[PDB]
Amino acid sequence: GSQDPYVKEAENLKKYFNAGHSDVADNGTLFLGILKNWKEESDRKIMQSQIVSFYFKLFKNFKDDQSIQKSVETIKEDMNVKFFNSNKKKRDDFEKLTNYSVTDLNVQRKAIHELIQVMAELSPA
Amino acid sequence: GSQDPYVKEAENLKKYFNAGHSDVADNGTLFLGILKNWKEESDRKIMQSQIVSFYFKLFKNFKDDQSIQKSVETIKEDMNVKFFNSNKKKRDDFEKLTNYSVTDLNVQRKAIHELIQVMAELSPAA
Amino acid sequence: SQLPAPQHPKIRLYNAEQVLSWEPVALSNSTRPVVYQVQFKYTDSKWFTADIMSIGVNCTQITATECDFTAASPSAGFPMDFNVTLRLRAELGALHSAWVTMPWFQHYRNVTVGPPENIEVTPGEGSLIIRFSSPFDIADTSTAFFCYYVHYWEKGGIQQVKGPFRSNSISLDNLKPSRVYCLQVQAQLLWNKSNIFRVGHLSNISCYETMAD
Amino acid sequence: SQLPAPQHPKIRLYNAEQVLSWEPVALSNSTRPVVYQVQFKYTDSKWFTADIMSIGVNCTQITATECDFTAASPSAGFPMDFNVTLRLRAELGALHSAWVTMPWFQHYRNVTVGPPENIEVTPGEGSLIIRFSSPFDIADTSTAFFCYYVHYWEKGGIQQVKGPFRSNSISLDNLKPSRVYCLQVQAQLLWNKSNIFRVGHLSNISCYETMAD
Amino acid sequence: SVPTPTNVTIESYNMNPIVYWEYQIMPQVPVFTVEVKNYGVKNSEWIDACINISHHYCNISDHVGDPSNSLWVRVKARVGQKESAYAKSEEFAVCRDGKIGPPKLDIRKEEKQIMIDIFHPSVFVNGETICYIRVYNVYVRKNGSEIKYKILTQNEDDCDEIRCQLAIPVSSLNSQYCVSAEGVLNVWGVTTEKSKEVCITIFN
Amino acid sequence: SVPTPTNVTIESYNMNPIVYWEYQIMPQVPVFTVEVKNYGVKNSEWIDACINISHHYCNISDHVGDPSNSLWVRVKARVGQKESAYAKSEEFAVCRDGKIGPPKLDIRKEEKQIMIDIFHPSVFVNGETICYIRVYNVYVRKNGSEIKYKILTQNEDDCDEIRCQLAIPVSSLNSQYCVSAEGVLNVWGVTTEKSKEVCITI
Ligand SMILES: *[C@@H]1O[C@H](CO)[C@@H](O[C@@H]2O[C@H](CO)[C@@H](O[C@@H]3O[C@H](CO[C@H]4O[C@H](CO[C@H]5O[C@H](CO)[C@@H](O)[C@H](O)[C@@H]5O)[C@@H](O)[C@H](O)[C@@H]4O)[C@@H](O)[C@H](O[C@H]4O[C@H](CO)[C@@H](O)[C@H](O)[C@@H]4O)[C@@H]3O)[C@H](O)[C@H]2NC(C)=O)[C@H](O)[C@H]1NC(C)=O
Ligand SMILES: *[C@@H]1O[C@H](CO)[C@@H](O[C@@H]2O[C@H](CO)[C@@H](O[C@@H]3O[C@H](CO)[C@@H](O)[C@H](O)[C@@H]3O)[C@H](O)[C@H]2NC(C)=O)[C@H](O)[C@H]1NC(C)=O
Ligand SMILES: *[C@@H]1O[C@H](CO)[C@@H](O[C@@H]2O[C@H](CO)[C@@H](O[C@@H]3O[C@H](CO)[C@@H](O)[C@H](O)[C@@H]3O)[C@H](O)[C@H]2NC(C)=O)[C@H](O)[C@H]1NC(C)=O
Ligand SMILES: *[C@@H]1O[C@H](CO)[C@@H](O[C@@H]2O[C@H](CO)[C@@H](O[C@@H]3O[C@H](CO)[C@@H](O)[C@H](O)[C@@H]3O)[C@H](O)[C@H]2NC(C)=O)[C@H](O)[C@H]1NC(C)=O
Ligand SMILES: *[C@@H]1O[C@H](CO)[C@@H](O[C@@H]2O[C@H](CO)[C@@H](O)[C@H](O)[C@H]2NC(C)=O)[C@H](O)[C@H]1NC(C)=O
Ligand SMILES: *[C@@H]1O[C@H](CO)[C@@H](O[C@@H]2O[C@H](CO)[C@@H](O)[C@H](O)[C@H]2NC(C)=O)[C@H](O)[C@H]1NC(C)=O
Ligand SMILES: *[C@@H]1O[C@H](CO)[C@@H](O[C@@H]2O[C@H](CO)[C@@H](O)[C@H](O)[C@H]2NC(C)=O)[C@H](O)[C@H]1NC(C)=O
Ligand SMILES: *[C@@H]1O[C@H](CO)[C@@H](O)[C@H](O)[C@H]1NC(C)=O
Ligand SMILES: *[C@@H]1O[C@H](CO)[C@@H](O)[C@H](O)[C@H]1NC(C)=O
Ligand SMILES: *[C@@H]1O[C@H](CO)[C@@H](O)[C@H](O)[C@H]1NC(C)=O
């Protein structure tokens, strides 16, 4: 009935990926176990950022599977709503940080340069 | 005189990578420009997590250059102090999330399974 | 080849309705009816054809000059949180027109909210009880909700606005007893992400007399 | 081959000092002095040899049975925020002993804080003014600072504790004038990350008389 | 070879799920073993729930960890000393596939209003999961007309651990207020059973 | 070919940096052009600061973006219609390499204490960078001995937009309180100039 739009599409991907078989329970958990350890939003957003970046990476590999394209991009918008608060700038800035190549020689030189001022505001005000 | 230990070591890596040449100013900024758009700590920690994960990956590639190992590992600990609040669990959980292979068939099926309960708590608590 | 694009398209965002309409395209040498194709897209996504599989209504290769996303069933249509972009083109077999792309909309941001439905007023001792239904049913009340305002006044008197209040029932206490008062109910949709509001339309004026004591 | 490992190592974390010591290693068949190698490591890092480039003091192949990281200059040594792990071994040329691994330590977490230095007391009207130096100089006050306590009591009276206070100067107001009061100054290091506190050592007893009027 | 069981189903009410299955009649009395495997446990392995039991059910309330975590159930048959292949079930989420009881409604009159108490179903009150109620659909019928109300659990001023309240103004005229309420689950929107309609009248 | 300039240096006081260089004396009078390239601007290219100038200096107060952002300066020489190769300078961070003026100290007596006002240096005058003061090292010498104080800018109860205050108790007996104060920058710990020591007597 009334449920967030991701629920319908997420369990559709479960069938496409056979995520409903009993063998998935093995080898502990990826995200669910860690997310319960951190209740403070500052701590949560640190972990969720890496998890959201993981799913965006995963969806990018399956951008050619037209069977699930509706479910994929529907989940992406709900992530854009729930995690980025529908802020397009927040979404685009996030996308920029991920696409940075750690092997681009030009990128690492700039990263080492900005390192000082990054550490300067790592701690809270 | 008295300055946080990263300053001394960061400018040492600056010289090893030739990050002091005038050519680095080209092609905008990676992190500094974005970080000025987000003043709320929730928004900051979202971006800083991607930035901190970037540096840890970069340092992992240069673990063989023994010339800079001192400068590299000092900055890593200061990140563990400033960003992870010296919480070893916070540091260790972060490393697990990064090391997950997005091409490992076993990993993506578990990720698709856990997707529902992750989305359930993406929004802030009431 | 190339066809003339559909004229003056409009997206109707009233209450929970979501209807895209446009003016028909005609030709001089027309042998069979021209069809149209509607497509939708999210904030940074690929264009999807509006078919029963994608969105639950079939709006591709259709003869009609409108497409109703919310007609099929309850909860159907685009989620009111989403950043949705629609586009449209007319085609006659191999020939098709250019894409007429609508502006992006978020339903909560662009809806024109109607007045509260089924307004019932019962008089009380120097007061009036107002019960009404919400302009439309919202799935997640935490993300968006209604704030109601009542514009009441004694016959021949000056306006007074009581509100806002969250409940669908309100008591207009402290009134002159055995006197006629006229009222209007107007809603206000509040979306916490936007922190900007949609001012709802007022209901019809209706006058009632309070009780004796 | 194999040599005996150094016996009973100790880490002295008093104020800003950082000294690693151990008991010397001797052999029955000893031809030349045994050398020692000290190494340090962070939370998740590689082992480094303690040489003039790494830490600013030369603690590799040293004849001494101790190594002082903080002797060279102010702020030299390991940063008081860092998680540092030390290990030690004795070697005589090609022969070397097993690694004696110390427990991990964070300077702010294991330090034994000393009493305030240079305590000066001047009497006032029904009060006593206390000025003192900090137990040690902290580079970043925002990450760590000191909270001071003064244990005062009339001679032959019951203990009273005024504090804590941020300033290095405090006024012991509301005292019986022209009466003898004894005081002790004790600092307490507060680290916001740990949310656990370091109880400092108390200073020597010193009694003083208030003014008459 | 021994035949494998068939028609494995799981039915949960108030987070007390029962496993059911069908088996053909045989000359001997077969015994069955029921094994549960939860998602979210390190190095997860099948936990035995019912061992060598002769009937066609197994109450597995004790193997329910998080009501929102998926779990699988398989059952095998033993006749004599020979066993059959396992009969595995579909994934089962207590929050999604199960059903929750109705809330208990209490009504009482005041001078200018009516205070409706909505007590949570007995599941959540006893002496940190995803699965709970986020909104209450409280239907209030005054004479012929019904209007839907919504009470959010997150509202600390309207709900607490024991109850949720709703205040409706009323008048002196004769009126018949009948109230029924239902709960909506947080993630899957599963609606609890509708409460027993409690009414009240305005005689004055 | 025309000779290149030498000894390019940048000296900054109160975030007003000046570029200096040395050039050999020649029969003609050479003119120079100074070009600046800042870090942190999109599509960054060398910006002209001083154009065809005959003397050996160029004030770049207008080309200072973030006082903590590195910037580079290069200069070429023109004699007649022939130009020289550029003389590029080392990277320059105003917060790191520059120097800041002293804070203004005010002293006044109260009934049981002395109120010391530490006015922020004249740089921060209204008329969001990393570069500011995090702690104030306030040295208070009472008779023979001085003790260092630390006032954090983040303390809303001790600092405001205009000043930072410190209260020190005193007694009626003869005492000489002399106070000087300096600021420490956030990132590089660069110390500002020490304030003119102001004293007071009881
Ligand atoms: C409901 O959905 C609607 C769509 O159906 C959403 O509507 C859009 O929202 C955005 C964001 O708020 C608006 O963008 C801004 O609008 C400003 C106003 O536009 C001016 O120009 C219009 C006409 O312009 C055209 O004609 C002129 C003259 O021929 C040409 O010179 C010009 O190039 C165009 O070809 C006028 O009709 C209008 O009245 C204004 O005068 C824009 O000015 C603005 O640009 C600003 O920002 C730029 C950088 O971001 C900057 O470079 C510019 O200089 C300028 O400062 C931007 O376009 C849309 O206008 C708006 N659409 C409509 C139709 O209003 C809407 O957001 C959503 N609901 C709600 C509640 O917002
Ligand atoms: C969505 O709706 C449109 C129309 O509302 C569907 O297109 C139409 O489908 C009908 C039935 O398939 C077609 O009629 C058939 O025509 C063939 C000859 O082409 C004839 O043999 C049949 O007996 C029948 O009359 C109709 O032509 C067609 N319209 C167009 C313009 O092609 C469409 O199929 C629907 N889409 C889905 C996914 O259901
Ligand atoms: C760190 O300090 C130790 C000792 O404190 C240094 O090791 C010692 O270095 C001295 C001088 O290099 C050695 O003495 C020399 O011995 C050679 C013969 O081996 C002789 O020809 C010289 O005239 C001089 O006497 C001493 O042997 C050596 N000790 C050991 C045990 O090897 C060490 O070099 C210092 N490290 C650094 C990086 O400075
Ligand atoms: C390099 O150029 C800049 C910009 O011209 C100079 O900065 C100027 O410095 C003065 C002195 O600190 C600032 O104060 C001014 O004071 C006068 C009266 O004393 C007043 O009339 C002005 O309105 C102003 O408040 C001034 O704001 C500042 N800017 C300008 C445009 O003058 C800088 O001094 C130069 N460097 C050197 C070494 O001269
Ligand atoms: C909603 O999504 C639309 C579709 O991407 C966005 O519209 C584009 O926004 C970019 C950046 O602002 C512009 O360069 C494009 O010109 C826009 N396209 C159109 C057709 O207008 C829109 O900005 C998004 N809005 C929000 C609030 O997320
Ligand atoms: C400080 O760093 C040391 C070095 O890694 C940590 O020591 C290990 O920590 C993990 C996780 O707590 C344990 O599983 C290991 O057994 C520890 N090793 C030893 C030798 O004790 C230490 O935990 C770190 N402390 C903090 C608070 O981060
Ligand atoms: C299945 O078994 C569980 C466990 O015994 C039952 O839950 C019990 O319910 C009774 C009735 O309220 C309580 O007295 C027990 O304390 C409960 N036990 C536990 C462990 O919670 C459940 O009712 C059973 N289901 C059926 C259908 O019989
Ligand atoms: C910057 O990007 C431009 C555009 O591709 C490229 O030509 C140039 O070499 C790049 N320089 C650096 C230092 O990355
Ligand atoms: C889990 O670990 C086992 C043991 O290494 C391995 O065989 C299996 O492929 C892993 N993946 C899953 C999804 O269980
Ligand atoms: C001396 O002999 C003992 C064994 O008896 C051995 O442990 C020790 O290392 C030897 N030392 C040398 C210098 O040969």
Ligand SMILES: *[C@@H]1O[C@H](CO)[C@@H](O)[C@H](O)[C@H]1NC(C)=O
């Ligand atoms: C320092 O204290 C920590 C925390 O209690 C403890 O784990 C550790 O063993 C201590 N280190 C030493 C050298 O005593």
Ligand SMILES: *[C@@H]1O[C@H](CO)[C@@H](O)[C@H](O)[C@H]1NC(C)=O
């Ligand atoms: C430049 O400065 C250096 C010292 O920094 C000095 O030795 C030299 O003479 C100066 N002139 C030239 C042309 O290098």
